[PDB]
Amino acid sequence: MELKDDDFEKISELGAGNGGVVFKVSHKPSGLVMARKLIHLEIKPAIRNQIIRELQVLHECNSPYIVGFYGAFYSDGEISICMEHMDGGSLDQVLKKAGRIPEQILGKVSIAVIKGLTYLREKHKIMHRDVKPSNILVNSRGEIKLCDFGVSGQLIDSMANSVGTRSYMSPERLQGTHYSVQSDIWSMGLSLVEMAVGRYPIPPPDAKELELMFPPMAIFELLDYIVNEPPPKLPSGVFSLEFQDFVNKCLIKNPAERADLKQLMVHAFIKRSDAEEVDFAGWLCSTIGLN
Numbered sequence: 001m002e003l004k005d006d007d008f009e010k011i012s013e014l015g016a017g018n019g020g021v022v023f024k025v026s027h028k029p030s031g032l033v034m035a036r037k038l039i040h041l042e043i044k045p046a047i048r049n050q051i052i053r054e055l056q057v058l059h060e061c062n063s064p065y066i067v068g069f070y071g072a073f074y075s076d077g078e079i080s081i082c083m084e085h086m087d088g089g090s091l092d093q094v095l096k097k098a099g100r101i102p103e104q105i106l107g108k109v110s111i112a113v114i115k116g117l118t119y120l121r122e123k124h125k126i127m128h129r130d131v132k133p134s135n136i137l138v139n140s141r142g143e144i145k146l147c148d149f150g151v152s153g154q155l156i157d158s159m160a161n162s163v164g165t166r167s168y169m170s171p172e173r174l175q176g177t178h179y180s181v182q183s184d185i186w187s188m189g190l191s192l193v194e195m196a197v198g199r200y201p202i203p204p205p206d207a208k209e210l211e212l213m214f215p216p217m218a219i220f221e222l223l224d225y226i227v228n229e230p231p232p233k234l235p236s237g238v239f240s241l242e243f244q245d246f247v248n249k250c251l252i253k254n255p256a257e258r259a260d261l262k263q264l265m266v267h268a269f270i271k272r273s274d275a276e277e278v279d280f281a282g283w284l285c286s287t288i289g290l291n
């Protein structure tokens with residue numbers, strides 16, 4: 001069935017970002033509850049047609065580690081991207097109510113992220129380009145899925161002019177155009193540290209700050225740090241030695257020396273997390289009071 005603007009009904013607002021706003025809506029014809037993202041674009045109708053046409057490949061992106069897609073269309077002054085509603089929300093959301101996310105859970109999260117990235121690259125030859133806590137969704141069924149990946153080249157271009165203070169961009173991507181899939185690994189690493197420590201990893205916390213846990217920097221000040229200062233390490237002692245090595249392999253400034261999906265897939269931290277028996281659904285639901 002084809003999605004149409006008048007066939008929807010707003011229920012509430014799931015949130016908003018710099019690029020658009022997403023509502024929890026009901027698709028009356030099917031009775032199915034969906035997440036509808038609205039992206040206001042003040043651009044010619046010809047180009048928007050290309051965008052809507054490029055978003056269609058989303059129907060071919062079927063994976064347990066990727067947010068389900070229902071359809072994309074243009075309504076009145078904005079394109080709509082309709083997707084599966086994840087009652088658990090984004091990790092950055094659960095990160096707030098949780099304050100911090102256990103290494104056990106992060107291991108499962110890491111597996112889903114790696115597999116999602118791997119799927120996108122192997123079966124669709126595309127990189128995410130925007131991996132960060134807010135683009136990792138989870139539901140009461142325990143599923144962990146990636147969303148907001150660059151499927152439409154045209155959309156990427158029309159969004160080239162916004163950003164935001166806190167950046168998850170790799171050093172190579174911040175410096176130039178000489179970046180690719182490896183750039184996503186850096187983002188995952190940084191996102192893991194954030195979720196593991198309880199706040200944006202840069203600048204790193206001091207001895208006194210860590211002891212407590214266990215003003216924002218200026219635009220240039222933060223980017224200069226990322227590019228020149230050494231990468232964010234994970235606090236030793238409170239976290240596993242395998243997990244520490246995992247993020248380290250992720251946060252290597254040089255993209256060619258940095259670990260890739262293939263390597264991380266068979267890394268000690270993943271093998272270990274893979275075997276571990278963790279009840280993500282239970283944790284996710286109790287921490288955010290859902291189930």
Ligand SMILES: COc1cc(F)c(F)c(Nc2ccc(I)cc2F)c1NS(=O)(=O)C1(C[C@H](O)CO)CC1
Pocket residue numbers: 017018019020037039055058066067068069081083130146147148149150151152153155156159
């Ligand atoms: C250009 O990125 C993008 C380029 C694309 F081709 C996309 F299809 C998207 N969005 C997107 C991708 C997969 C699913 I399942 C659901 C979605 F909503 C974005 N990301 S985004 O919707 O969050 C976006 C940019 C974002 O706000 C900047 O961080 C465009 C508004």
Ligand SMILES: Nc1ncnc2c1ncn2[C@@H]1O[C@H](COP(=O)(O)OP(=O)(O)OP(=O)(O)O)[C@@H](O)[C@H]1O
Pocket residue numbers: 014015016017018019020021022035037067083084085086087089090093134135137147148164
């Ligand atoms: N399919 C979905 N199901 C449930 N909630 C969602 C879904 N998609 C997005 N959201 C919620 O909507 C919020 C806004 O999403 P959006 O992608 O527009 O911005 P963002 O990723 O938070 O930030 P930015 O665009 O600035 O990087 C998210 O934080 C998330 O909690």
Ligand SMILES: [Mg+2]
Pocket residue numbers: 017134135147148
């Ligand atoms: Mg997002």
